[PDB]
Ligand binder design. Structure first.
Ligand SMILES: NC(=O)c1ccc[n+]([C@@H]2O[C@H](COP(=O)([O-])OP(=O)(O)OC[C@H]3O[C@@H](n4cnc5c(N)ncnc54)[C@H](OP(=O)(O)O)[C@@H]3O)[C@@H](O)[C@H]2O)c1
Ligand SMILES: C[C@]12CC[C@H](O)C[C@@H]1CC[C@@H]1[C@@H]2CC[C@]2(C)[C@@H](O)CC[C@@H]12
Ligand SMILES: [Cl-]
Length: 325
């Protein structure tokens, strides 16, 4: 049911999401200006119709540049492209939600985004700093009020500024807070969380499926393994014996096997590459399918261990990763 030309899956609000997208986080210091724009253009040329971004990635203007250029030349219509943006922790104050989205729209120079999600359930102190800490290094936590933040998100959809609403890094409890909200108008259609063969999110996926919430797998290739923020204790995902062995069987790379695995089970994948060859490689996942025994074997690689633990925030009242799921 999935092809290179047609691979959108339904969202609960009547919209749909391309099952693969291009991730666009890249370390600002070691990334050349323009690398993002070029990559988004190459991805669109390749067949990608979903781009995942965020204002705090510092390159949203490049994403917009690329999308607008492809629209202007007639490669795609605006309706053909799915862009997901994110509301950061320092912008959870309800009154800040719409102005924050409007900033992203102005940066993209677009009229709406397709998906706008709460980036993390944790709120930080509002201000000109993305990661607010005092001189002692104490993370300055703001008293999160997720339902009130969600209400402001809902107003953005009502205004037509965003087609679909979702969340990211939310656990079952936090999803329930929203789903059980008094006078809920728009349920979350998507939860973006780390997902791949070493962390297949069995319980969270089951829960989301029961509530018609689609999981988007961030870091679907196991991350860039930057130790400065990534847990590099586990061996590199793409070096796995089974994944590489299966790769040989299908003449595909471990990366391609890993992406096929998640999309085959209805999980959206947003691998990031700013490399011409790898952008194309990651998209070539519609010309084969894994056997049910292969899916089981891959799903059995499940470590129930995370590459992205964000331990520095483990004591925040809204830290998502203390609960089971
Ligand atoms: N919501 C959240 O909290 C959250 C958290 C993390 C990420 N995200 C989103 O998810 C996107 C992807 O996650 P991610 O960037 O952290 O990690 P990832 O997509 O799992 O892996 C990215 C790394 O893999 C490399 N790579 C890409 N394709 C490859 C291939 N075929 N073979 C070998 N290496 C390959 C990339 O380098 P090259 O670019 O040089 O190819 C990069 O170093 C992010 O960009 C961001 O959009 C969201
Ligand atoms: C922005 C990222 C990555 C993309 C993802 O969408 C969200 C995370 C949150 C934690 C960031 C990390 C990037 C690297 C940071 C800034 C480290 O220097 C300290 C905390 C990390
Ligand atoms: Cl933001």
């Amino acid at each position: 049911d999935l092809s290179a030309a047609s691979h959108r899956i339904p969202l609960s609000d009547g919209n749909s999401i391309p099952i693969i997208g291009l991730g666009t986080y890249s370390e600002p210091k070691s990334t050349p200006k323009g690398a993002c724009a070029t990559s988004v253009k190459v991805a669109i040329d390749t067949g990608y119709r979903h781009i995942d971004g965020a204002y705090i990635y510092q390159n949203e203007h490049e994403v917009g540049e690329a999308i607008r250029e492809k629209i202007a030349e007639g490669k795609v219509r605006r309706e053909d492209i799915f862009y997901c943006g994110k509301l950061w922790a320092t912008n959870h104050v309800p009154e800040m939600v719409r102005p924050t989205l409007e900033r992203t729209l102005r940066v993209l120079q677009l009229d709406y985004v397709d998906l706008y999600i709460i980036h993390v359930p944790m709120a930080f102190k509002p201000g000109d700093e993305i990661y607010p800490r005092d001189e002692n290094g104490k993370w300055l936590y703001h008293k999160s009020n997720l339902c009130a933040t969600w209400e402001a998100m809902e107003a953005c959809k009502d205004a037509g500024l965003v087609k679909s609403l979702g969340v990211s890094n939310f656990n079952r409890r936090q999803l329930e807070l929203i789903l059980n909200k008094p006078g809920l108008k728009h349920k979350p259609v998507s939860n973006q969380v780390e997902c791949h063969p070493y962390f297949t999110q069995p319980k969270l996926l089951k829960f989301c499926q029961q509530h018609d919430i689609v999981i988007t797998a961030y870091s679907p290739l196991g991350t860039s393994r930057n130790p400065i923020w990534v847990n590099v204790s586990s061996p590199p995902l793409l070096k796995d014996a089974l994944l590489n062995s299966l790769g040989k069987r299908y003449n595909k790379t471990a990366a391609q096997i890993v992406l096929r695995f998640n999309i085959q089970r209805g999980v959206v994948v947003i691998p990031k590459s700013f490399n011409l060859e790898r952008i194309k490689e990651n998209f070539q996942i519609f010309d084969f399918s894994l056997t049910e025994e292969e899916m089981k074997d891959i799903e059995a690689l499940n470590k129930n261990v995370r590459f992205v633990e964000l331990l520095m925030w483990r004591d925040h009242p809204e830290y998502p990763f203390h609960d089971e799921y």
